[PDB]
Write a protein that binds this ligand. Structure first.
Ligand SMILES: [Zn+2]
Ligand SMILES: [Zn+2]
Ligand SMILES: [Zn+2]
Ligand SMILES: [Zn+2]
Lengths: 55, 1097, 46, 65, 50, 49
């Protein structure tokens, strides 16, 4: 929601190669930047299932 | 009195292309694999049985591959076209079945049709549906008739198996070691084992080194162990020359130092030197008979042939220890080319052996304890094993054969669909065995042995320069023969048995050794008669035309090569200063009385190998024929490959220019085929108005490139204008680009899958989320249809969904979360088609073909078919372009300064020929080492009233005054490249970061930022800008604020130190996030960095 | 709502609903394209 | 794919003279005399008509229809 | 089979015999067009078997 | 210099990716090595008991 006015009309829109949350009423952002994994590590990481990781 | 010349001689080239040539190699190899080799592999493992419960067996009778089909239907096969396999993202394979007989309960049961696997079918093969079809039937199957084929289609992608190049097996190689010692090596490889044994002279004596021995042993001990015990016989076998005995003296002395004088003592010594895998004597004898020199066969423990072989090897080493006659590895006469056929044969053999082993294990596990219910193999004939093996080996490209210990990578590559020339050139590629292991520069160089076999100029510019090559226009790869009649003719031609005489005859100057695929065939005298008779018998037809025979007078060895993979080239036989081919034969060939096979049978044209042509004399032209001539070159321009054939007048240009031109033509933009509209690929570049070149080579007519051009002819004027073409740049006309010149189309693919999971739930597409305020879909869901799928014909903008995909989160009511396929793109795209298909897994595959129409602008890279790559510097209007007396304004203005440094006279010749052609309505030829001369085009120009040098009177368009110097106008065939400024333009905001290290990503498609490498840091250090470097590498990249405790020096969190359980000494500190990651990793490695903080003052 | 599609060889207008096996009458081809939209689209001659 | 309407260099209408040119190919006229009779004095239109490849019918052979 | 953008580009290159002096320049925007500064040409061709 | 305890690093060095497309995940090699080490410790304890 909006921290100042309290408007809950926050919309997800893609910027110029940037993701953030912004309200359409006052144009104020509440959370900018997103953390995503790289494919350089994706091929190195190994898979783990629930059954094998529970016993 | 000039020698008469056959003008129509070049007509021998197309006829050959009717039976062989560019793409026929892989097709014939795959046909031989699926028709002959597979049956031999099945016969080699026809019977498989288990040790337990004897009298049980599984006998294979005959294996069939059938026609390609698809298992989409429920337990029903259906003929499927390769285009349908491309669309449905499936494989184009045929069911491999086999008929067998087995024993269930000692009652023999026979099966006549039992499928066991699926073999991917190469296109245009014998069993492929595309062969034997007319262009109309190709249109009915949505396949281009001009498509070269020969590539596999797996999971919807087109993979091509490159021709592998390796060293010839079973051959002695004399080479220098790291310390300068000139030793020998032999890699004996049979159908079962491969072993490389070496011999060195490190201490004046010859030591033999093998992987199965603990320490290298003297050669004289091995001689004594192999039957021959007298030292005199050993010396006679080595050689009778004084220097030979002087060199072999130390070996005899070292042997006499020990007490080894009999075969038993030598065998005991070897067994003592034998590594673990009298018993030692038997193991030594077995290693000497089977493991060492596998290619040399012993009848019944008779090492006479092996003794002669090692004696000849020692003699060659002694002769090489003097004059530095060291053999070279880059000599292509000792190279072998493995096609896809041999690789697929080895892979199928390995897979069949694994399947038989698995079946035997299952039998041993099931039969002895299950029940009175008799076990049968049919209930365990796994059909997915071979299929999955083939699919993975073709798709991933990594081949791991444990039975042969072969670990190869990059065998299969994605077929490049940039243009027709791109695929046609990638189909005839050849990779090296080195694969960039070291910058040797030896094999990367251009060896003279590549004459007529591989294209000299065609090579990828970059790190792979010299390791990836292309075959010539007229070349052929030989196959394996039976080798029976060769041995029979050699024995009948007077070749005495090597076992009948001692090795002393090997030291005679007139006695020449005859070999056979590395095996000592025997000795002979007057080898000239032998070679002449063998060549005459091969020409007569009693011996296969691919069997090569060569003679080395330095080593005095007659090599007879009959193994496959050797490169051969056709040559016209010349006898007594006159070629056998006359004008009458060429007239009969043109009229259809005879074909190339008739030329082969009538002793007119014969195939020559590199080793064979090493001893023969070839003439380039008829006027070059002298008394000592044996063959005549068919056509010189056949030296170039497929890509290099596109170069008009390549003999007038520089070699780096030709290399760059081939590299850019492999990336040239143009039409792909007649089915380019129904084809849906991940990236396709098409030209709006493609035009065939005015100066076309004969190779272009041979490869039918004129039917599918990849460029346009524009009136280029070579001059300097406005200074916007300083370095390689070019100026384009605004009106030309406005009237359709250079207009291009980019087709991209967007694929989505709706698959069913383990639970009884499926991915479903929701309808467009209509806005209740306006009763219309939202801007994001505007292009969606009623079914939630975007409809063709509309325009797609950035941040717009194409398929409103929603997937369940469970795998009680299902909970669906939205994962729509959004369109990432700077510019708008138009939907041409939306294909919806259904696989056997009930997964709906939706493919949208987005289209973008792009106009040439500043930044687009253009080529001029001469390696003169350029970028559009300025787009001036039509009025600003200069005009001639006729009123023609140029479309492209190129810098003349690029001509002196590169010496591209071929471009000027092509321009003049094209101008003459467009004046007289003709197509001039830019054939290599020939073509239309300058005098002819000059006469054509002077006849039509134009200047005989291309330069015309031109008035400046800007000032309206005539120029002091004439401008060189003419039509040039310019081709646009795929390198666009729109796709290469990139800008990076703050954006996302990586989870491990909080830094921007790498690639542009991943929204990545630029990397200030080590060299950039070095430059910034040299400049001395400390604050700029700090802002770039710390503030703007991975800035973070950590909490460090001033007592223990460890890292805290939220102003608290868990180590000391206090927070009074904890202070904040700015730091790169990578540095904190390094500190944490070091603390994980027990290397604890203790930070002692202090005030900044 | 009647959703229409076009097969790959007979090119006949076939009406199928959601969660149906992609097929076509009087044939067995399994390539189903979507018809062009009826909405107005503006193009520039540049 | 198809014959362009305008010439790249000058801009003379040339799309209307394509099929007629094909007729001149169906007749006994060569390339040069046909391009002369069509009224193409400058060599740019001659190159436009001569170097053009007719690929529209090859694509229509693969059209849905 | 011809692309929509290529079709529009080909149609744009087609000259019109209309007298330009009797018309005026279209103002900025106004995609609807007025009687003075625009002309409409309808092209509807349906190909079928003979 | 002789280790008796192993310092397993935080999750910042060992990123975990939730691959919802299949029935699995993505964990780095350090997690697998630590899992194998703990498994070996448990096996040694079981053999001692
Ligand atoms: Zn606000
Ligand atoms: Zn502390
Ligand atoms: Zn149909
Ligand atoms: Zn023109």
């Amino acid at each position: 929601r909006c921290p100042d006015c309290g408007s809950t009309e926050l919309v997800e829109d893609s910027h110029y190669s940037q993701s953030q949350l912004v309200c359409s009423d006052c144009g104020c952002v509440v959370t900018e930047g997103v953390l995503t994994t790289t494919f350089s590590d994706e091929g190195n990481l190994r898979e783990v299932t629930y059954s094998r990781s529970t016993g | 009195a000039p020698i008469p010349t056959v003008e129509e001689k070049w007509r021998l080239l197309p006829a050959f292309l009717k039976v062989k040539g560019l793409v026929k190699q892989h097709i014939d190899s795959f046909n031989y694999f699926i028709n002959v080799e597979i049956k031999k592999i099945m016969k080699a493992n026809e019977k498989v049985t288990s040790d337990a419960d004897p009298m049980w067996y599984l006998k294979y009778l005959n294996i069939y591959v059938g026609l390609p089909d698809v298992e989409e239907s429920f337990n029903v096969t259906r003929p499927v076209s390769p285009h349908e396999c491309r669309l449905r993202d499936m494989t184009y394979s045929a069911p491999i079945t086999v008929d067998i007989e087995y024993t269930r309960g000692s009652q023999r049961i026979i099966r006549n049709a039992l499928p066991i696997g699926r073999m991917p079918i190469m296109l245009r093969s014998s069993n492929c549906v595309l062969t034997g079809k007319t262009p109309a039937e190709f249109a009915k199957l949505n396949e281009c008739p001009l498509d070269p084929g020969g590539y596999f289609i797996v999971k919807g992608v087109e993979k091509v198996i490159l021709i592998q190049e390796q060293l010839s097996k079973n051959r002695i190689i004399v080479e220098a070691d790291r310390k300068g010692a000139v030793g020998a090596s032999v890699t004996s490889s049979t159908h079962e084992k491969k072993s490389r044994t070496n011999m060195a002279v490190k201490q004046g004596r010859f030591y033999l080194r093998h992987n199965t021995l603990s320490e290298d042993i003297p050669i004289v001990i091995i001689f004594k162990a192999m039957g021959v015990e007298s030292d005199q016989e050993i010396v006679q076998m080595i050689g009778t020359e004084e220097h030979v005995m002087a060199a072999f003296g130390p070996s005899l002395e070292e042997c006499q130092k020990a007490q080894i004088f009999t075969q038993m003592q030598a065998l005991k010594y070897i067994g003592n030197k034998v590594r673990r895998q009298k018993t030692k004597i038997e193991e030594a004898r077995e290693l000497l008979a089977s493991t060492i020199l596998t290619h040399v066969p012993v009848k019944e423990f008779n090492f006479r042939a092996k003794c002669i072989y090692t004696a000849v090897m020692v003699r060659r080493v002694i002769l090489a220890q003097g004059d530095n006659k060291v053999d070279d590895r880059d000599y292509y006469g000792n190279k072998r080319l493995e096609l896809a056929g041999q690789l697929l044969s080895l892979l199928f053999e390995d897979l069949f052996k694994k399947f038989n082993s698995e079946m035997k294990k299952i039998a041993d596990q099931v039969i002895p304890k299950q029940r009175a219910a008799q076990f049968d193999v049919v209930k365990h004939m796994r059909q997915d094993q071979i299929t999955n093996g083939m699919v993975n080996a073709i798709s991933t490209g990594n081949w791991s054969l444990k039975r042969f210990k072969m670990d190869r990578q990059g065998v299969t590559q994605v077929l490049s669909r940039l243009s027709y020339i791109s695929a046609l050139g990638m189909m005839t590629r050849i990779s090296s065995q080195f694969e960039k292991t070291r910058k040797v520069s030896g094999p990367r160089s251009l060896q003279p042995s590549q004459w007529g076999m591989l294209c000299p100029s065609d090579t990828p510019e970059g790190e792979a320069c010299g390791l990836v090559k292309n075959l010539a226009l007229m070349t052929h790869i030989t196959t394996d023969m039976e080798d029976g009649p060769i041995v029979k003719l050699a024995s009948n031609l007077g070749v005495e048995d090597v076992n009948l005489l001692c090795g002393e005859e090997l030291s005679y100057p007139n006695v020449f050794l005859v070999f056979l695929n590395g095996n000592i065939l025997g000795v002979i005298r007057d080898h000239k008669k032998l070679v002449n008779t063998f060549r005459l018998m091969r020409r007569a037809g009693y011996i296969n035309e691919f069997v090569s025979i060569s003679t080395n007078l330095t080593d005095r060895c007659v090599y007879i090569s009959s193994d496959g993979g050797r490169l051969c080239r056709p040559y016209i036989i010349v006898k007594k200063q006159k070629p056998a081919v006359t004008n009458k034969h060429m007239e009969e060939l043109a009229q259809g009385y005879r074909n190339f096979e008739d030329f082969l049978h009538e002793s007119l044209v014969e195939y020559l190998d590199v080793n064979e042509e090493n001893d023969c004399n070839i003439a380039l032209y008829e006027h070059t024929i002298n008394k000592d001539t044996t063959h005549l070159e068919i056509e010189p321009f056949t030296l170039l490959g497929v890509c290099a054939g596109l170069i008009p007048y390549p003999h007038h240009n520089q070699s780096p220019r030709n290399t760059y031109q081939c590299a850019m033509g492999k990336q040239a933009m143009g039409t792909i085929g007649y089915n380019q509209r129904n084809r849906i690929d991940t990236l396709m570049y098409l030209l709006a108005y493609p035009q065939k070149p005015m100066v076309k080579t004969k190779t272009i007519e041979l490869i039918e490139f004129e039917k599918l051009p990849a460029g346009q002819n524009a009136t280029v004027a070579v001059m300097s204008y406005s200074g916007y073409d300083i370095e390689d740049a070019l100026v384009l006309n605004k009106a030309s680009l406005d009237r359709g010149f250079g207009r291009c189309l980019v087709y991209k693919n967007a694929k989505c899958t709706l698959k069913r999971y383990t639970n009884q739930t499926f991915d479903k597409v929701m309808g467009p989320m209509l806005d209740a305020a306006t009763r219309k879909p939202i801007w994001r869901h505007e292009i969606l249809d009623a079914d939630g799928i975007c409809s063709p014909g509309e325009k797609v903008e950035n941040k717009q969904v194409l398929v409103n995909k929603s997937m369940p989160t469970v795998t009680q009511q299902p909970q669906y979360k939205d994962v729509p396929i959004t369109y990432k793109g700077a510019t708008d795209s138009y939907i041409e088609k939306v294909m919806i298909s259904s696989n056997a897994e009930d997964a709906f595959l939706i493919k949208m073909l987005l289209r973008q129409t792009r106009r040439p602008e500043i930044g687009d890279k253009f080529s001029s078919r001469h390696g003169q790559k350029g970028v559009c510097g300025l787009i001036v209007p039509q009025e600003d372009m200069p005009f001639c007396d006729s009123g023609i304004c140029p479309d492209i203005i190129m810098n003349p300064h690029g001509f002196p440094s590169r010496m591209t006279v071929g471009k000027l010749i092509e321009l003049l020929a094209g101008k003459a052609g467009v004046l007289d309505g003709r197509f001039h030829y830019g054939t290599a080492f020939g073509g239309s001369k300058v005098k002819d085009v000059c006469e054509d120009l002077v006849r039509h009233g134009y200047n005989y040098l291309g330069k015309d009177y031109v008035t400046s368009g800007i000032t309206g005054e005539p120029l002091e110097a004439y401008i060189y106008f003419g039509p040039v065939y310019y081709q646009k490249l795929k390198h666009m400024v729109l796709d290469k333009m990139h800008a990076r905001a703050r954006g996302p970061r990586a989870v491990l290290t909080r830094q921007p990503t790498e690639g542009r498609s991943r929204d990545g930022g630029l990397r200030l490498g080590e060299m950039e840091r070095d430059c910034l250090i040299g400049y001395g800008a400390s604050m700029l470097l700090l802002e770039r590498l710390m503030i703007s990249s991975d800035a973070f604020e950590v909490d460090v405790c001033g007592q223990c020096g460890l890292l805290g969190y939220s102003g608290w130190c868990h180590y000391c359980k206090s927070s009074c000494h904890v202070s904040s500190l700015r730091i790169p996030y990578a540095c904190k990651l390094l500190f944490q990793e070091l603390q994980s490695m027990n290397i604890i960095p203790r930070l002692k903080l202090s005030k900044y003052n | 709502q009647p959703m229409i599609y076009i097969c790959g060889e007979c090119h006949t207008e076939n009406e199928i609903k959601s969660r149906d096996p992609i097929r076509c009458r009087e044939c067995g081809y399994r390539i189903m394209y979507k018809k062009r939209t009826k909405r107005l689209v503006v193009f520039d001659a540049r | 794919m198809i014959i362009p309407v305008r010439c790249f260099t000058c801009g003379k209408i040339v799309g209307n003279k394509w099929e007629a040119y094909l007729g001149l190919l169906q007749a006994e006229y060569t390339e040069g005399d046909a391009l002369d009779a069509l009224g193409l004095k400058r060599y740019c239109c001659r190159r436009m008509l001569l170097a053009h490849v007719d690929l529209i019918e090859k694509l229509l052979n693969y059209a849905p229809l | 089979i011809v692309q929509d953008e290529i079709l529009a580009h080909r149609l744009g290159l087609i000259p019109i015999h209309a007298d330009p002096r009797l018309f005026e320049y279209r103002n900025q925007g106004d995609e609807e067009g007025t009687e003075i500064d625009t002309l409409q040409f309808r092209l509807q061709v349906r190909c079928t078997r003979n | 210099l002789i280790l008796t305890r192993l310092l397993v690093p935080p999750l910042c060095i060992r990123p975990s990716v939730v691959s919802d497309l299949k029935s699995g995940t993505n964990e780095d090699d350090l997690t697998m090595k630590l899992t194998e080490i703990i498994f070996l410790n448990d096996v040694i304890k079981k053999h001692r008991i």
